[PDB]
Symmetry: C3
Subunit: 347 residues, 3 copies
Amino acid sequence: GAEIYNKDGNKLDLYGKIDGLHYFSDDKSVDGDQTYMRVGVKGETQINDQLTGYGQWEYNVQANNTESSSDQAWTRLAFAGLKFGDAGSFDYGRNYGVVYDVTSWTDVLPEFGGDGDTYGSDNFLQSRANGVATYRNSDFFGLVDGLNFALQYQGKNGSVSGEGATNNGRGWSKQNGDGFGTSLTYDIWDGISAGFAYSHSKRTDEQNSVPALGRGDNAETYTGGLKYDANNIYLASQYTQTYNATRAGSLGFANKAQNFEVVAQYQFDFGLRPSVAYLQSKGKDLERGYGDQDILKYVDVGATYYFNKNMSTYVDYKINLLDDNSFTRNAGISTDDVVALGLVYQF
Amino acid sequence: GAEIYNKDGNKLDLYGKIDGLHYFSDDKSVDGDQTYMRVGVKGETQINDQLTGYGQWEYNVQANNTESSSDQAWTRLAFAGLKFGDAGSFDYGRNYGVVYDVTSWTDVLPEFGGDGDTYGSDNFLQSRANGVATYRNSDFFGLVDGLNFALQYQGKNGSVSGEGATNNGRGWSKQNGDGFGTSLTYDIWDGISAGFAYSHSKRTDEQNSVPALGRGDNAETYTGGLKYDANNIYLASQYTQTYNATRAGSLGFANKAQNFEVVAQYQFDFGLRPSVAYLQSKGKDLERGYGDQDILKYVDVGATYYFNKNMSTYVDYKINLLDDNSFTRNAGISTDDVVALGLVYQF
Amino acid sequence: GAEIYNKDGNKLDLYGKIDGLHYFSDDKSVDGDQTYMRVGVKGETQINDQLTGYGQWEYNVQANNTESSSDQAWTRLAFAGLKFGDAGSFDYGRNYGVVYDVTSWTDVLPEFGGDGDTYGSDNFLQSRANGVATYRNSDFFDGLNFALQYQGKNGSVSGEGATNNGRGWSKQNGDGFGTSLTYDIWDGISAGFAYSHSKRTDEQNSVPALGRGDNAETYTGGLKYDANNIYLASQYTQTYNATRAGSLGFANKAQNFEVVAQYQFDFGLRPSVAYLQSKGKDLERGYGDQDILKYVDVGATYYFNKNMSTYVDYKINLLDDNSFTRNAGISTDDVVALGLVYQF
């Protein structure tokens, strides 16, 4: 929300939140203060009757460390584009990969869920990504109401230096080669929706040499998801099968993985919204004797009280079901439970 | 000021300044360009007759170094809260420790004074801190005009790793354990005020193990202060005794210390505002031979010319009274004088 | 720029852009995604009939790396000032060195050109700089614009030459000044001259292999034609111990030439051709004379409207790959850029 400018066919929208947030947990890398804020701009310019231009930026600013700390802010979203009426839209920048057009349905927990769990950011086209060109088509050319598809290309984001470098190099866990993805979602009835997504990306030489886990030239995801949203009820599931594309913590990638998320929610009139959910990630054919391993397994219960559109409070209880083993220690995967209390101002 | 949004019970206030600032000094770590700017957002949302929600962000941006320099921006404030009419208010985030509800009375110098002097930021509840829950009450439930109090809790903010760690780990000088604080201020007249504040925090293991100076399980501060502010006159003083809480420069903490600050100012009608002040911090029972030492001692003379509410210029002259000794050299405490010239745009 | 506040003589102007930008090149340190955005505020407060106060901030934010990458934002401009009616103005902060009052005339390519090419940021008074005090005057107490500028020392991180805001030798400067003069001879036709003199630092005369001297100097002259849908401009600049010989140091003397031609069609297309070179002279370590920068530039920008544009730019590199270009890390490969830009 918050339209600070609307004049002569040009609109500016300032949005964000301040999220006062504390975590309680035996895991000392998670426990403690997690206050952060988000600020962003959504901009729109009418060019002619059939053509609109637009841009969007969204910045994350941590407030949970000191004034002398490092790396406390980063860009989540930054892209510019054109909207061609009902012929579709094109944008390029740092944007969401299309896979999340489906997995976003289960990313609605009070605090946990979403990226950092069954997938992450800078993780091929699973979440937010550098350098994605994205074509989107609404209502299949104004013909089939409720049918949306998207086509997406990402250029190589490679190593810092050496043969595989690009200008914007990173470490192997956040690299990608050339890749594409596609999504498709259909509102079969009102309230009910189904959706599929596919993605294919080249892997980099660093991904196939530096970490011990995960080998192959290609990274692939296959995703299907369901969603009921009506009569104050929200049900959603997402099943995703991945090849060489899901992080096995810090140790590398899983050659194969199966990811499952499901969530149920009710919205009471006076503003309470309880939530239960289950999330797992099963990793297959890991090297170095790891074999089959749980990457992620937890039940999630919590609630959000909405005071109004600008202010809410919430608790979330992550009931961790992973067994502590040599895989979870060496990969740095948390096996402890976590409670989260938060108070959020939004604009 | 600068209300950029006020619609349907939601308001948004964009504030900040651009401070064009040069320091002249023999201290090479202080001398030279000091230009920086502040930006932030105050947001308020009416929820119902008795309840208002709010949040506030404030960001510091250095402009005195290069475009390839590191760590030039940080968050000063990020918190969200609720205001329950005259039953009080609550907020959590990065915010001011309640001790500063009193010591703020002497932090009105043209440029110097405030944090970095007798206390600093991320210094228990003496100034800005991570993860403070703060209950505030003004006019003692509407019954006693001018009587204000505050109760405050702060969660542990620990080491980067090891036993004593939290998510948001920092070095020993900005760590704190669990702690609390309280403040109380009374307006006897509409100009004259007195105030007290207390805080008690647990020290962390790194604070007792890494630096040479300061031993103890607990940090304590006791603060009393007086203020005259009317008829264009401003007089203020503040006396604070601390235990394991005041920084002995880079060498650790002072087992006990006494801090005194006092300041007088006069506001002429044409906009000039002269200022004289005196500031000291006397440390006691320091280890390694140091015994009693001055941590800070200086006289300050300066003035601010206010063109209007949005634009001012100022000079400030810190006449440093410290002797250059083994302590001040080893602790990295400046003993040189400083002149500051500034031009400030504010919105 | 979007006026988000205007009340009781105080105006606030929010401006910026989002630049969806890809580079293609065999140079792996240039090739790839280059998406970034810029955001800024221009503030103006009426004080009295003969006095206005103002400030401006402009921030760069890279969006082409990960959420765990570091050093992805920096301040380009931050300054506060007073304007004394038409009798000119003063401002202090991080701002453009006055040399750019003239070289700005060739900095109009679709994408390339400007800082990074014949000169850089934090490069004495040639571009953006820390700690510049700038007095400016319109109509020389007519149509003749004059500026005088002083910069305090920005020196080493530690040691003899330190200041608070220390940096590496490539971006250091000592005490310096500059002046500029520009005039509109005919309508459309402008000429301009600029001089800067700056003390160098001990690190600049001891750490790099290239560039020795107590002072840095720039003489600049430039011409501009800007009427009838036509834009022509050139810039010739001579420098002593002021132009960067890549990573190796400074060039004892250099000669920099920049020229550009452009045409603006009514339906919004704006083709562009330009030529840029930097010739370094009297270099140490056997280098002698060397090309620092040499390329032809062709491209175009389509403007949908005042808020949205697309562009292509093609840098045709003419440098010969030799020992100087490799050791100094100067790119000799070509570059194509495609971008889409939203501006507010």
